[PDB]
């Protein structure tokens, strides 16, 4: 199918099966590419979900979302998988992807419509470093950022180029002021290599390196995987 075609095209060596826990943190388990066959797609892998926050459960791959990984030098193909209960062979009750599929099927069953379109724009922060601890002794979340508005007099390895965005004034500065143009371009390139149809990227309102990369829309489960 799709995954086999990509494996043949790019000589993929590893298959990375990815799912999502309740907390929303993506989980991945790797496997050799030589094990991909009919039985891999009809049975899936198995793993112990007991230590996942929220026993044995089947990782059933979804071949419609096979996409190359642009970070690993070894060519690895990423496959987003569903969680199947071995007792019932149906989608897991607590699997967020299964819940999203159930929601889209409910939408197409009530007759209101089909293929609900979700386009999310999430914003993120770029920091040079970050430190945080919290124990009986004390707590702290010190934050380090060369482009931060509070570093106007700091000492940097290389120099303090005093061009930096002020607080609540980092919205659309030119590259001399925003230190994140090239890294945002690299993020956009990686997203495109992962099949994401990006549409805009810029510096957000915040100082200390807030960026946004808006990408194109899709259906419920497709957009969840895309996010």
């Amino acid at each position: 199918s799709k995954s086999l075609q990509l494996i043949k095209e790019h000589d993929v060596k590893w298959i990375d099966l990815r799912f999502t826990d309740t907390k929303g943190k993506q989980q991945h388990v790797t496997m050799p590419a030589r094990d991909v066959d009919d039985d891999f797609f009809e049975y899936g892998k198995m793993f112990d979900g007991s230590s996942i926050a929220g026993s044995d459960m089947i990782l059933m791959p979804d071949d419609s979302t096979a996409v190359l990984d642009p970070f690993t030098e070894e060519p690895t193909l990423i496959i987003v998988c569903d969680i199947i209960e071995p007792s019932t062979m149906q989608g897991y009750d607590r699997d967020p992807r299964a819940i999203a599929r159930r929601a889209e099927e409910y939408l197409k069953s009530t007759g209101i419509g089909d293929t609900a379109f979700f386009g999310p724009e999430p914003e993120f922060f770029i920091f040079d470093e970050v430190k945080y601890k919290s124990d009986i002794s004390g707590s702290m979340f010190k934050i380090f950022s060369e482009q931060a508005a509070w570093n106007t007099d700091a000492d940097f390895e290389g120099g303090n180029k005093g061009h930096r965005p002020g607080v609540k004034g980092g919205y659309f500065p030119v590259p001399p002021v925003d230190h994140d143009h090239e890294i945002r371009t690299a993020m956009c390139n990686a997203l495109e290599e992962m099949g994401l149809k990006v549409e805009v990227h810029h510096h957000e309102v915040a100082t200390a390196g807030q960026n946004e990369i808006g990408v194109s829309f899709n259906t419920l489960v497709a957009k969840a995987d895309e996010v």
Binding site: T152, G162, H163, R164, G166, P173, P176, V177
Partner: protein
């Protein structure tokens, strides 16, 4: 002058250091030298909200020559980093540059002016306040009822002093030559302060 002496040396004794400039801090309260004026006459109190008409004329003289008084009671480019600016008087209001404390005795009735700052020379500031009050009393200047504001920069305060020195040069209390020399000194001082780069300008305009 003795108070400044003692405070400075006692600070030095413990290794600390006292400053008397009105505003050594931004983002926090400055320091002001409030002045309580109370003219007496043959042992009685002239200023007896309980203020006689003469006290109101004194306040009117202070109000009328407020910017010209700012050349002596506020002879500092710090003084206008602190500016109690509204040149009005009240007995309880905290937004008036002139206040009348709730004295418990009719003998101790006095007015308080809040714009002067400790950086002012005591002799010159006190003489300027008294001369303005005397002018207002002699000319029967009614202050009104409980709007002008004091100056906002030493440049305009010096300009107003140059244009309103007339009441000081009454009876020879202030010589015109002394006022001219004082104005030239303060003008060179203000010029020195004004034409020097501010780090806030590096905060604002460095990238633009």
């Amino acid at each position: 002058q003795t108070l400044k002496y003692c405070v400075h040396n006692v600070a030095d004794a413990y290794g600390k250091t006292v400053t008397f400039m009105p505003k050594p801090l931004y983002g926090d309260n400055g320091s002001g030298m409030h002045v309580h004026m109370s003219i007496a006459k043959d042992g009685k109190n002239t200023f007896a909200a309980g203020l006689s008409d003469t006290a109101l004329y004194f306040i009117g003289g202070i109000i009328k020559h407020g910017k010209a008084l700012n050349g002596f009671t506020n002879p500092s480019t710090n003084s206008y980093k602190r500016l109690p600016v509204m040149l009005a008087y009240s007995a309880r209001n905290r937004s008036a540059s002139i206040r009348i404390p709730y004295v418990n005795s009719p003998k101790a009735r006095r007015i308080e002016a809040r714009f002067p700052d400790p950086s002012a020379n005591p002799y010159l500031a006190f003489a300027a306040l008294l001369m303005a009050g005397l002018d207002g009393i002699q000319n029967k200047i009614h202050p009104g009822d409980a709007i002008p504001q004091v100056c906002g920069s030493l440049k305009e305060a010096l300009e107003e002093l140059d244009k309103g020195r007339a009441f000081l040069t009454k009876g020879g209390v202030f010589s015109d030559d002394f006022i001219d020399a004082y104005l030239e000194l303060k003008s060179e001082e203000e010029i020195k302060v004004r034409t020097f780069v501010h780090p806030l300008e590096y905060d604002l305009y460095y990238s633009v």
